[PDB]
Structure formats: C-alpha cells, structure tokens
Design a binder for these strands. Structure first.
Ligand SMILES: [K+]
Ligand SMILES: [K+]
Ligand SMILES: [K+]
Ligand SMILES: [Mg+2]
Ligand SMILES: [Mg+2]
Length: 126
DNA sequence: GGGGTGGGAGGTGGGT
C-alpha cells in the first residue's frame, strides 16, 4: 500500500513529468521526502527537469527544503549546471547563502563543478 | 557503481 507522496517521489526519480502532473492534481504531497531527505523538487532540480520544477513550485514545493546533508534544490541545480533552473529557484526565493554540511554554498558548488555562467548569476546576489 | 543524454519493470542494489 503506497501513497501519493511516495508515488510523486518515484515519478520525480524516474523523470516521469506526465505522471508528476497527474499526482499533483490528485493532491500528492509536494514536500514528501525520500530516505535521503530529497523532496521531488530536489530530484527535478538535479535532473534538469525545468518544467516540473515550475509545476512543483506552482503547487507550493518548499524552495529551501534541505536534505540530510543540508543540500537545497539550488545546490543540486548548481552542481549539474542547470542555469535556467537556478533562475527559477532564485525567482521563487531560493536562499543563496544556505551552506551544506561541508560549508559549501551553491556558489561554491557551481565553481567546483565548472559552471561559470550560473556562478556569475549567483555572484551578483552574494 | 553511478547518473538522469539509460529507463521506470526494482527501492531489501544505492545516491541525486
Ligand atoms: K535508479
Ligand atoms: K543499473
Ligand atoms: K539503476
Ligand atoms: Mg536548467
Ligand atoms: Mg553555467
């Protein structure tokens, strides 16, 4: 016996954007958390799923949700070079200063992973 | 194992 939250997480993990849209509409819990502390927003942000990122936020996903390592969606987008995703997160109130367990901000992670264009976007906001 | 340009049939295979 599963629930809408767990299904949402699975759909997010598998990149099934259509499935996500359905679950959202049937009222799935936007802030469900997997065993690592990832919300569906974490997974879409890491995966590069821009449209779903917008869907989740529309449905009120927590923009600054932190995982078990203190990583926010912003940290995950930054590690993967998803610039557009970064702008959308930022436009929705992402905190540029959140530090993960290692002290790193999104800025540092973006530098670490060679993502200079989104680095610049963040640099403006430090 | 590890990543999301591999896909969703798994989450008691594990991380994002
Ligand atoms: K997998
Ligand atoms: K595999
Ligand atoms: K796999
Ligand atoms: Mg992007
Ligand atoms: Mg970049």
């Amino acid at each position: 016996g599963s629930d809408l939250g767990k299904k949402l997480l699975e759909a997010a993990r598998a990149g099934q954007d259509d499935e996500v849209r359905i679950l959202m509409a049937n009222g799935a819990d936007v802030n469900a958390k997997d065993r690592y502390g990832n919300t569906p927003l974490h997974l879409a942000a890491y995966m590069g799923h821009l449209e779903i990122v917008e869907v989740l936020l529309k449905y009120g996903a927590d923009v600054n949700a932190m995982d078990h390592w203190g990583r926010t969606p912003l940290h995950l987008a930054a590690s993967r070079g998803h610039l557009d995703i970064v702008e959308v997160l930022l436009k929705h109130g992402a905190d540029v200063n959140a530090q993960d367990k290692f002290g790193k901000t999104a800025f540092d992670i973006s530098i670490d992973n060679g993502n200079e264009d989104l680095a610049e976007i963040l640099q403006k906001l430090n």
